[PDB]
Amino acid sequence: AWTTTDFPAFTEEGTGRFISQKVVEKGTRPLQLNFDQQCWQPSGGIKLNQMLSMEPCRGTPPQWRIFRQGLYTLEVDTRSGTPTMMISLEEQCPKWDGKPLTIDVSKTFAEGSKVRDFYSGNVATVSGGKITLQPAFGSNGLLLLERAETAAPAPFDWHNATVYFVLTDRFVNGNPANDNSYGRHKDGMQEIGTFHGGDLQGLTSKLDYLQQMGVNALWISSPLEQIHGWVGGGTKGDFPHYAYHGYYTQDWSKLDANMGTEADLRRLVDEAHKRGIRILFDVVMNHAGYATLADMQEFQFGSLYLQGDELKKTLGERWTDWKPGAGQTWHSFNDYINFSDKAGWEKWWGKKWIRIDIGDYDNPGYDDLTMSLAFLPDLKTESKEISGLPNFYSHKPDTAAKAIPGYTPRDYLTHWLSQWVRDYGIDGFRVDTAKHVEMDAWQQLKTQATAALAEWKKANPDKALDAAPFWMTGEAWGHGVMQSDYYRHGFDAMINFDYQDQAAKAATCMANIDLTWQQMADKLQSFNVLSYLSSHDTRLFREGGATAAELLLLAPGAVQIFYGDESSRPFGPTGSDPLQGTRSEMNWQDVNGKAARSVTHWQKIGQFRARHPAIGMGKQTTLSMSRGYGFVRESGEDKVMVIWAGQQQ
Ligand SMILES: [Ca+2]
């Protein structure tokens, strides 16, 4: 095994990587790693949180400087053939002496039965109703206690679901060729609001990576055709804002060319299903995307104050190629647009389709349902008027949208979204802006989507994992843990905004979460929610030290990993929009290096959750113990005990 003087013997933490942890005092010492009589030492100096190249030991050992007392982790990685190593520091709460725990399991696991700590893989035999186990390096003092007969994931349940929420554009660029669809440009600045180039092909390439994390639902940003152009970014227009996040839809009937082809979507869904991963589309029915110079020029709608030679002089051959000059911002292009012109702006969606404070359109209302959210065109979902297609679709010959006798705007929207479910076997939707569209519209969407999936599963019996119905979760801003009227208008679970602040209060002491977990375990006996630490419209949860994984994945109800939670993806450039930094590029360089053991930690807790529906669905009994923190959860035949030894410092 791997050893160094004055550290315990290294133990495997993910295949081909071995770690050791110890509370080390301030000072200096030599650093060599031994495997049998093989000796290795850092060859290029010693820094924290960096992959250190190693050489066979020669002369005086490299001197490692301990600038701060704390729990240090040494990591050795043999997956490159030559050992590389890594050094990292973790600098009224139960305390842990770092030594083995004796656990009373007499009420949980049978006398003489074998119990596994899933995290370490250590197995103990129940004797006098007790087992003794050492929490493994990287466990943070957790024992994940299960019957040793546990061997593989339990049947999928939405009430035990591990959802991975990915902004496809900011994850993996599978094909650079499709990065600049419809004349879209990078800004050459910090790319705050641009298409980075992430696509469905790229996302498909990481399905094994997600499967290893115990992910069994993949929530993707809408892949449907967005506005082609940009608007002013943030409060100051310091960046161009493109529809990289999928929330500014223009054509519901087509895939966005940046995301890829129909074939790419079919491969993503089919390969995801092959690995027991359900697909959720992020969907919008509340609004279409903003008017952009790209779309105005392409589809011949709107009105400009620029007439004569002044037009091509100012905005150029392609208006979307305009950049702000001296004394201008990315909002300044609006100065050239005549938003008051009735005739010009009717050529866009048309008066029968949207509310907006432009031209001759129905004015937005002064309520959540009919307001124009952030000046977005509000789709008339409640309208009973037979609309025909949007006016500007007359200049969009590539659309799959067809006029249908008697159809209202809502009928088109529910038909368009349902057709993706029918054609590809999409397992569910995450519904955006749920509080801004009337309940009856969401019920219609659910009914048609349910029919669509049943039709696909019947037509594709080889591909269908089960006969489970279509699943729908919604973002109703500020929704908590309660069975609201949403649950009686087509929603199987609502996104839980309240978990984030409760997790934050347990960031420095995991045991603080107990009351929240007891409440949620009891409340969610009768319904389901989708809880998160991080989101695109809140913040990235990075205060948990190494404990974010257990804080999320041991929560009752369905849980949502925001892409990069597993790798501590940093908050990115944000400009004058405080939310933009949450959509930073996936940190793949860190995943394969300094965040490698974090990813392994997430994989272990994620896999434990996938084996045990009791976690997501079980009644909780919090244990009374003289040392540490512990609870049991039980759902049908499934029973687990989670022990947390406490803080090692
Ligand atoms: Ca791409």
Ligand SMILES: [Ca+2]
């Ligand atoms: Ca609305």
